[PDB]
Amino acid sequence: ALDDIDRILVRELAADGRGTLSELATRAGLSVSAVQSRVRRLESRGVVQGYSARINPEAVGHLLSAFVAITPLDPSQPDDAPARLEHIEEVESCYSVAGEESYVLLVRVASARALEDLLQRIRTTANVRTRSTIILNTFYSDRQHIP
Amino acid sequence: ALDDIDRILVRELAADGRGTLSELATRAGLSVSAVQSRVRRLESRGVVQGYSARINPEAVGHLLSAFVAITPLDPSQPDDAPARLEHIEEVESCYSVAGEESYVLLVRVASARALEDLLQRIRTTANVRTRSTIILNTFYSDRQHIP
Amino acid sequence: ALDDIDRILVRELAADGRGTLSELATRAGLSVSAVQSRVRRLESRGVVQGYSARINPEAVGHLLSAFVAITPLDPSQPDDAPARLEHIEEVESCYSVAGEESYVLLVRVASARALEDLLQRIRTTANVRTRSTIILNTFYSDRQHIP
Amino acid sequence: ALDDIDRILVRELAADGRGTLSELATRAGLSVSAVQSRVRRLESRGVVQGYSARINPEAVGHLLSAFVAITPLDPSQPDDAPARLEHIEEVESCYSVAGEESYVLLVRVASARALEDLLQRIRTTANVRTRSTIILNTFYSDRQHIP
Amino acid sequence: ALDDIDRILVRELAADGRGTLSELATRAGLSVSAVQSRVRRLESRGVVQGYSARINPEAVGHLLSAFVAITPLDPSQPDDAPARLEHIEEVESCYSVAGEESYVLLVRVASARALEDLLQRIRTTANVRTRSTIILNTFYSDRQHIP
Amino acid sequence: ALDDIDRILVRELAADGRGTLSELATRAGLSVSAVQSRVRRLESRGVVQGYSARINPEAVGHLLSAFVAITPLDPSQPDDAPARLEHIEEVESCYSVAGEESYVLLVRVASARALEDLLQRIRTTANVRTRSTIILNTFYSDRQHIP
Amino acid sequence: ALDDIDRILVRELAADGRGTLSELATRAGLSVSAVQSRVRRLESRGVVQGYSARINPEAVGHLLSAFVAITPLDPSQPDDAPARLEHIEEVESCYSVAGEESYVLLVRVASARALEDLLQRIRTTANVRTRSTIILNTFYSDRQHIP
Amino acid sequence: ALDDIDRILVRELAADGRGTLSELATRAGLSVSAVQSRVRRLESRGVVQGYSARINPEAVGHLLSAFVAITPLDPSQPDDAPARLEHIEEVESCYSVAGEESYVLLVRVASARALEDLLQRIRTTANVRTRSTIILNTFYSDRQHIP
């Protein structure tokens, strides 16, 4: 389960991570004491994982974002590319996928010429071929849907 | 225009979006009022776009995630697609992209059967062909990087 | 569940659909009475669906087999292509898929020139574009794995 | 060489692989001995390849099915791949194919995580790149057609 | 129905289409009348389709040859394309093909500029998209093989 | 040049390689002596290369034709694939091309299963990757255009 | 022809468009009078077309360059896309091509988000589908080879 | 740092690379010395990269131009390709690119046969696969745009 008072909470917190123990308890129909517990139980069970402010990447100097799809070159070696690229800070996300390639990364970078460097570094560090698709614009990002 | 203080605030709010102002203040060597002021300006300019609990899509019943690349059936018409899909709730993100397709969506759904039904809804509401890549595993995501 | 005596039965019957109520009961460790019931319960619950002899398609005149991938052309219309192609007897199988195309069919046909006809008939009857991949050889077919 | 009687027997055995000989006999206007004889010859020539309970892959825990197209990393070596994959049990079928890839597999697995692990095993045991298409739904399969 | 004599006549006529009957006769151990008879039957059944001087496309001013794969803009309409292109003279051959495109043409033209103009004519008269592959060199062609 | 009496001859002979020294001389406007010379000058200059009867490939047992595109695997070796495949009789034609692949071959073969063999033999003999496109039907073949 | 004193001149001027009537006449072996004429004859015959300084596009604010491949959508209309896009100043070059697409443009633009606009404007103005490939780096540009 | 004066000089030098300083001076309202100074600084910073007669590739015997996309056979090795191809003279430009290939070259050559020979040289000196697109016509090129 996830009792649908727990549900109203996760919707509220997904839409506004700074929402207060206080103002939640109105919309929810509970007490500042009662709300505060569910939330701690929600963080312990792995349901809310973190609270993050959403930073605009262009404002901090990331003018090019890209999906980078990668496939290991040598199948006799352990396929450990996520772990291998983890220290690379410009990889924001790393997914395994069912398609032509094995993983997709979302990468942010200062310019077209920084991407070229990142790609070579991805390639020599994990041991992969790269294919990259450049993002032109983000129309909306992380609208978590709670069903 | 992002000085060193502003840089510090956005790193802390990226790592913890419920940082209270008193903690942010003592961390940037400012008063609580000056912090609150900085933070408001970050919000009203482009820089902080909102705040969100990072929610486990599995815990809430989204067992299948996919990327869907979409391309308009008639590309001559000025292109509507992000506005028209905005109201389908299981679409979480929408990017326009270079190369052969026009947009990439991230989508989350309860099952294989709910995915095929969503693909129909997407094909019809934006008037688009679709190419889907199921996500098998998320190794890490949203690791925002402030340089 | 599916109690792992039920499991030994489904393995046995998957490997040999003509296996006798009799000879099963040895390998299984039960009675001709006891075996016969589980099997009827297995057919009622949707677990074994049919018994079929595996016919070699070349011996009956199907010299070309093909996967045919299809995508509806008009997304304002109901996507009903499986139902629409059901009367076509040369479609042996019909799957919906997550990839570039919406469905994959396996088709068997007398010759290269019969395939060309089948394709036009698929196209005008369901309302689809076709892409076909020709099978050169079947190395093994339907080895059902019972885990 | 398939006369009208042989044609009748293979249709009936396709539709019901546990047809007993007495039912087949009265259906082809032969004696039970002549039927048994015909059937044995069908078996020893290419025509009937075995008999199988058609099992529900879901009921036995295979919730994910995929097509996987594979292509050798070094195509100059005479090609081993069906023989080398024969011993991976969750591979159900193996076809060689015309066009850009060399083989198509059908594969069934318990979950997304078990699929990625199988893709690694396939990449390494046949020395191959993979392209996967998840199957969302089976509308009908194995409808064998005797013309 | 092709006996040994017929086989001999078609090999000789493939290698030399101006073989006179007296030479064909002494080569098949027949009379000139019997040869003429055989040859006429070969013509009226499918077997010999006509006779042609093999002409050097360069000597007559066709310095550029290309393959053009074509695919209908609207594949739902029964497909007209070979009949409609039959009257464009610089189209030399027309095949329908499996896979992603519908037909392949061979085309010969005086120059790069005459090729672009032909591509327009093809796109418009068959209502098709085109994919062109220039031929750089012909190493050998039409080596007909009678087995 | 190629004086346009020479032109009327090549058109005539392209359309009918069995056309007689005699009947040509009407349509052309010359003498049985005069026609016969131009023709011998046309065969000496490399303009007409051969006379061939056009054999229907299905009538001689070639039930599958295919384009096979090939690219050498090792660029440190001499690129000699035409010469290397010349003894292979099922290659009817061999072209070098400007596109994704280096050469295109047209191949004719008894069945889908003979093609699979031919492909492996092409691969180990020349040292190439193969991609094949199967011909479903020839609508018209070798209409030489004389401009 | 192009007498190979004319050749030494075009090499010199291709390498250095500011090279003086004076200093050319040494390297060339002629007179300030003799050099000056050949050059004017070279500009009249269409051989040298212009003299241009090579501007670095990043220094003037063009941070993203792209190849944009385009294909008209309606083949019943005149194919006039070069003329139609001529007023668009960010198209630096426009070529017709033999491949999947009809033209290739080289485009320079301020950012990823300006490219998105340019693409829509290309599409509605000429009447085309777009496919774009983003340039990451120019290693060398316009080395004219004089053979 | 490009002020209005510098902007004017680079426009004029783009449109006419043999503009003499006296003409540039009276056009920017500067003295000939100040112009010469500005121009030298433009040269030594990144901004003017050299000066070139724009030469007609046809007049000098390059009748065939092509784009060639190249991709390394082994992408794990740090990539050499622009440095290694620098010495092939008929390569005019070299870009690295996003997406599936790694570089795009522009190449000019005397004929189809000289193109195939260049493709071999490219495949071997950079150790790369090639995809070629012949250019049929240049509608306009190098129209440099100073914003």
Tab-separated table of N, CA, C and O in Angstrom, chain D residues 73-76 100 129, chain E residues 133, chain F residues 68-75 77-82 84-85 94-105 119 122-132, chain H residues 69 71 73 119-120 123-124 127-132:
chain	number	residue	atom	x	y	z
D	73	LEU	N	30.471	-8.978	-33.729
D	73	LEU	CA	31.528	-8.000	-33.658
D	73	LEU	C	32.616	-8.202	-34.733
D	73	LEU	O	33.084	-7.230	-35.305
D	74	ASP	N	32.966	-9.460	-35.030
D	74	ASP	CA	33.830	-9.780	-36.126
D	74	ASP	C	33.144	-10.718	-37.117
D	74	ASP	O	33.154	-11.932	-36.936
D	75	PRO	N	32.519	-10.175	-38.179
D	75	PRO	CA	31.784	-11.068	-39.105
D	75	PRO	C	32.601	-11.963	-40.054
D	75	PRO	O	32.034	-12.726	-40.839
D	76	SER	N	33.912	-11.872	-39.990
D	76	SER	CA	34.794	-12.601	-40.951
D	76	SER	C	34.898	-14.084	-40.560
D	76	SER	O	34.935	-14.965	-41.434
D	100	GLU	N	20.327	-5.992	-42.031
D	100	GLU	CA	21.509	-5.382	-41.501
D	100	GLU	C	22.022	-6.222	-40.341
D	100	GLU	O	23.195	-6.377	-40.190
D	129	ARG	N	26.816	-7.428	-30.980
D	129	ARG	CA	26.049	-6.281	-30.438
D	129	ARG	C	24.573	-6.615	-30.451
D	129	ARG	O	24.187	-7.545	-31.180
E	133	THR	N	22.291	6.333	-54.417
E	133	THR	CA	23.666	5.830	-54.260
E	133	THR	C	24.329	5.917	-55.648
E	133	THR	O	23.932	5.196	-56.568
F	68	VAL	N	23.417	-7.213	-52.407
F	68	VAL	CA	24.158	-7.477	-51.241
F	68	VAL	C	25.158	-6.349	-51.123
F	68	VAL	O	25.998	-6.197	-51.974
F	69	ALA	N	25.104	-5.540	-50.091
F	69	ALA	CA	26.061	-4.457	-50.004
F	69	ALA	C	27.220	-4.898	-49.104
F	69	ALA	O	26.972	-5.495	-48.047
F	70	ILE	N	28.469	-4.587	-49.449
F	70	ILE	CA	29.605	-5.128	-48.695
F	70	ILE	C	30.671	-4.067	-48.436
F	70	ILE	O	30.876	-3.161	-49.197
F	71	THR	N	31.339	-4.146	-47.324
F	71	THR	CA	32.381	-3.192	-46.967
F	71	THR	C	33.539	-3.988	-46.388
F	71	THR	O	33.329	-4.752	-45.429
F	72	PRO	N	34.743	-3.838	-46.968
F	72	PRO	CA	35.908	-4.494	-46.342
F	72	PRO	C	36.084	-4.176	-44.858
F	72	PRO	O	35.757	-3.087	-44.360
F	73	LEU	N	36.521	-5.166	-44.131
F	73	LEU	CA	36.646	-5.061	-42.660
F	73	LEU	C	37.967	-4.500	-42.213
F	73	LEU	O	38.030	-3.918	-41.171
F	74	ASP	N	39.019	-4.738	-43.012
F	74	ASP	CA	40.386	-4.297	-42.718
F	74	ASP	C	40.964	-3.353	-43.780
F	74	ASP	O	41.370	-3.772	-44.890
F	75	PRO	N	41.023	-2.089	-43.443
F	75	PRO	CA	41.519	-1.125	-44.407
F	75	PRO	C	43.076	-1.142	-44.571
F	75	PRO	O	43.591	-0.512	-45.519
F	77	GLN	N	44.479	-3.811	-45.599
F	77	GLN	CA	44.664	-4.758	-46.688
F	77	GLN	C	44.236	-4.121	-48.006
F	77	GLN	O	43.451	-3.210	-47.986
F	78	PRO	N	44.803	-4.555	-49.148
F	78	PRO	CA	44.333	-4.106	-50.474
F	78	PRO	C	42.822	-4.303	-50.692
F	78	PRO	O	42.247	-5.325	-50.372
F	79	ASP	N	42.168	-3.325	-51.268
F	79	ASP	CA	40.744	-3.477	-51.356
F	79	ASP	C	40.513	-4.116	-52.724
F	79	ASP	O	40.477	-3.444	-53.739
F	80	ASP	N	40.430	-5.438	-52.736
F	80	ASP	CA	40.349	-6.198	-53.989
F	80	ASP	C	39.091	-7.118	-54.083
F	80	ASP	O	39.161	-8.177	-54.740
F	81	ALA	N	37.950	-6.717	-53.500
F	81	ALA	CA	36.830	-7.627	-53.324
F	81	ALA	C	36.191	-8.068	-54.640
F	81	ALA	O	35.810	-9.256	-54.774
F	82	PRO	N	36.087	-7.143	-55.642
F	82	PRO	CA	35.582	-7.570	-56.974
F	82	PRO	C	36.338	-8.743	-57.547
F	82	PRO	O	35.706	-9.762	-57.867
F	84	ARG	N	38.353	-10.781	-55.900
F	84	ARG	CA	38.159	-11.938	-55.071
F	84	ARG	C	36.865	-12.687	-55.207
F	84	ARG	O	36.837	-13.825	-54.849
F	85	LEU	N	35.788	-12.074	-55.698
F	85	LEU	CA	34.463	-12.703	-55.711
F	85	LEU	C	34.092	-13.097	-57.117
F	85	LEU	O	32.967	-13.604	-57.384
F	94	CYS	N	28.696	-6.444	-59.979
F	94	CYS	CA	29.472	-5.956	-58.892
F	94	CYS	C	29.809	-4.481	-59.160
F	94	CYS	O	30.462	-4.149	-60.167
F	95	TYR	N	29.347	-3.590	-58.299
F	95	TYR	CA	29.538	-2.151	-58.522
F	95	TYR	C	30.268	-1.553	-57.337
F	95	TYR	O	30.041	-1.965	-56.158
F	96	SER	N	31.109	-0.548	-57.575
F	96	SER	CA	31.574	0.247	-56.401
F	96	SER	C	30.633	1.373	-56.301
F	96	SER	O	30.056	1.756	-57.275
F	97	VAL	N	30.470	1.904	-55.096
F	97	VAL	CA	29.390	2.842	-54.852
F	97	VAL	C	29.888	3.962	-53.928
F	97	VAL	O	30.877	3.763	-53.199
F	98	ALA	N	29.252	5.123	-53.994
F	98	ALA	CA	29.424	6.174	-52.965
F	98	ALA	C	28.261	6.127	-52.022
F	98	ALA	O	27.181	6.621	-52.402
F	99	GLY	N	28.360	5.548	-50.842
F	99	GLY	CA	27.257	5.616	-49.840
F	99	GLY	C	27.739	5.066	-48.514
F	99	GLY	O	28.840	5.382	-48.145
F	100	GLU	N	26.950	4.239	-47.795
F	100	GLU	CA	27.452	3.630	-46.512
F	100	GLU	C	28.379	2.412	-46.695
F	100	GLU	O	29.161	2.078	-45.856
F	101	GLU	N	28.304	1.788	-47.841
F	101	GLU	CA	28.946	0.558	-48.083
F	101	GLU	C	29.844	0.844	-49.301
F	101	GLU	O	29.751	1.890	-49.877
F	102	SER	N	30.796	-0.018	-49.595
F	102	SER	CA	31.786	0.174	-50.662
F	102	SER	C	31.361	-0.440	-51.959
F	102	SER	O	31.699	0.108	-52.995
F	103	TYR	N	30.685	-1.610	-51.924
F	103	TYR	CA	30.241	-2.244	-53.174
F	103	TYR	C	28.827	-2.744	-53.034
F	103	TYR	O	28.436	-3.050	-51.918
F	104	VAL	N	28.112	-2.915	-54.165
F	104	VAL	CA	26.837	-3.538	-54.214
F	104	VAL	C	26.966	-4.664	-55.226
F	104	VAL	O	27.513	-4.408	-56.317
F	105	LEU	N	26.427	-5.864	-54.915
F	105	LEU	CA	26.470	-7.018	-55.773
F	105	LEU	C	25.025	-7.361	-56.044
F	105	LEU	O	24.209	-7.165	-55.195
F	119	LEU	N	26.112	-15.809	-48.338
F	119	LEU	CA	26.550	-14.656	-47.585
F	119	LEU	C	27.773	-15.040	-46.795
F	119	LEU	O	28.725	-14.277	-46.733
F	122	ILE	N	30.693	-15.148	-49.186
F	122	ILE	CA	31.154	-13.813	-49.524
F	122	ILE	C	32.023	-13.222	-48.413
F	122	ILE	O	33.072	-12.594	-48.644
F	123	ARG	N	31.596	-13.437	-47.195
F	123	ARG	CA	32.245	-12.834	-46.067
F	123	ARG	C	33.645	-13.435	-45.849
F	123	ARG	O	34.579	-12.730	-45.540
F	124	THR	N	33.810	-14.740	-45.991
F	124	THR	CA	35.090	-15.321	-45.595
F	124	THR	C	35.987	-15.200	-46.798
F	124	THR	O	37.152	-14.855	-46.670
F	125	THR	N	35.435	-15.345	-47.989
F	125	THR	CA	36.293	-15.098	-49.122
F	125	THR	C	36.800	-13.643	-49.402
F	125	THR	O	38.006	-13.465	-49.547
F	126	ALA	N	35.952	-12.617	-49.481
F	126	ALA	CA	36.481	-11.263	-49.701
F	126	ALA	C	36.633	-10.822	-48.257
F	126	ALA	O	36.190	-11.567	-47.361
F	127	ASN	N	37.206	-9.743	-47.818
F	127	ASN	CA	37.054	-9.931	-46.296
F	127	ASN	C	36.053	-8.921	-45.675
F	127	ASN	O	36.447	-7.901	-45.142
F	128	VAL	N	34.744	-9.178	-45.876
F	128	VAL	CA	33.715	-8.117	-45.811
F	128	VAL	C	32.562	-8.332	-44.814
F	128	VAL	O	32.211	-9.439	-44.530
F	129	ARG	N	31.971	-7.255	-44.282
F	129	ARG	CA	30.613	-7.347	-43.703
F	129	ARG	C	29.548	-7.307	-44.792
F	129	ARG	O	29.783	-6.702	-45.864
F	130	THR	N	28.424	-8.019	-44.599
F	130	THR	CA	27.381	-8.055	-45.645
F	130	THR	C	26.076	-7.355	-45.190
F	130	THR	O	25.735	-7.358	-44.015
F	131	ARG	N	25.336	-6.735	-46.087
F	131	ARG	CA	23.999	-6.287	-45.706
F	131	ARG	C	23.135	-6.672	-46.915
F	131	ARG	O	23.453	-6.299	-48.046
F	132	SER	N	22.054	-7.383	-46.742
F	132	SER	CA	21.379	-7.784	-47.964
F	132	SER	C	19.953	-7.257	-48.005
F	132	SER	O	19.320	-7.251	-46.962
H	69	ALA	N	31.263	11.490	-44.120
H	69	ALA	CA	31.253	11.301	-42.688
H	69	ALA	C	32.187	10.067	-42.323
H	69	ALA	O	32.168	9.054	-43.026
H	71	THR	N	33.817	7.467	-39.167
H	71	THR	CA	33.791	6.990	-37.831
H	71	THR	C	34.890	5.932	-37.508
H	71	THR	O	35.061	5.011	-38.264
H	73	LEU	N	37.146	2.871	-36.471
H	73	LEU	CA	36.984	1.453	-36.265
H	73	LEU	C	37.171	1.028	-34.794
H	73	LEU	O	36.424	0.194	-34.308
H	119	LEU	N	38.633	7.365	-51.113
H	119	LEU	CA	37.922	6.727	-49.977
H	119	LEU	C	38.802	5.668	-49.363
H	119	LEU	O	38.922	5.581	-48.121
H	120	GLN	N	39.456	4.870	-50.228
H	120	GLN	CA	40.482	3.873	-49.703
H	120	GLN	C	41.533	4.565	-48.921
H	120	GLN	O	41.759	4.225	-47.786
H	123	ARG	N	40.016	5.577	-45.604
H	123	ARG	CA	39.742	4.431	-44.730
H	123	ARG	C	41.067	3.964	-44.120
H	123	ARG	O	41.155	3.699	-42.902
H	124	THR	N	42.115	3.882	-44.931
H	124	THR	CA	43.345	3.391	-44.332
H	124	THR	C	44.166	4.325	-43.512
H	124	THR	O	44.676	3.917	-42.478
H	127	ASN	N	41.914	4.936	-40.312
H	127	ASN	CA	41.366	3.703	-39.728
H	127	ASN	C	39.859	3.870	-39.397
H	127	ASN	O	39.449	3.716	-38.249
H	128	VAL	N	39.026	4.078	-40.424
H	128	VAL	CA	37.730	4.723	-40.220
H	128	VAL	C	36.780	4.039	-41.158
H	128	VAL	O	37.263	3.498	-42.127
H	129	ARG	N	35.476	3.937	-40.875
H	129	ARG	CA	34.506	3.644	-41.957
H	129	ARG	C	34.015	4.946	-42.555
H	129	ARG	O	34.169	5.989	-41.898
H	130	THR	N	33.497	4.920	-43.800
H	130	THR	CA	33.176	6.148	-44.477
H	130	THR	C	31.719	6.069	-44.890
H	130	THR	O	31.201	4.966	-45.180
H	131	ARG	N	31.028	7.210	-44.934
H	131	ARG	CA	29.679	7.336	-45.570
H	131	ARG	C	29.810	8.594	-46.459
H	131	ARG	O	30.165	9.697	-45.944
H	132	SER	N	29.669	8.434	-47.780
H	132	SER	CA	29.803	9.547	-48.753
H	132	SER	C	28.512	10.079	-49.261
H	132	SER	O	27.713	9.300	-49.621
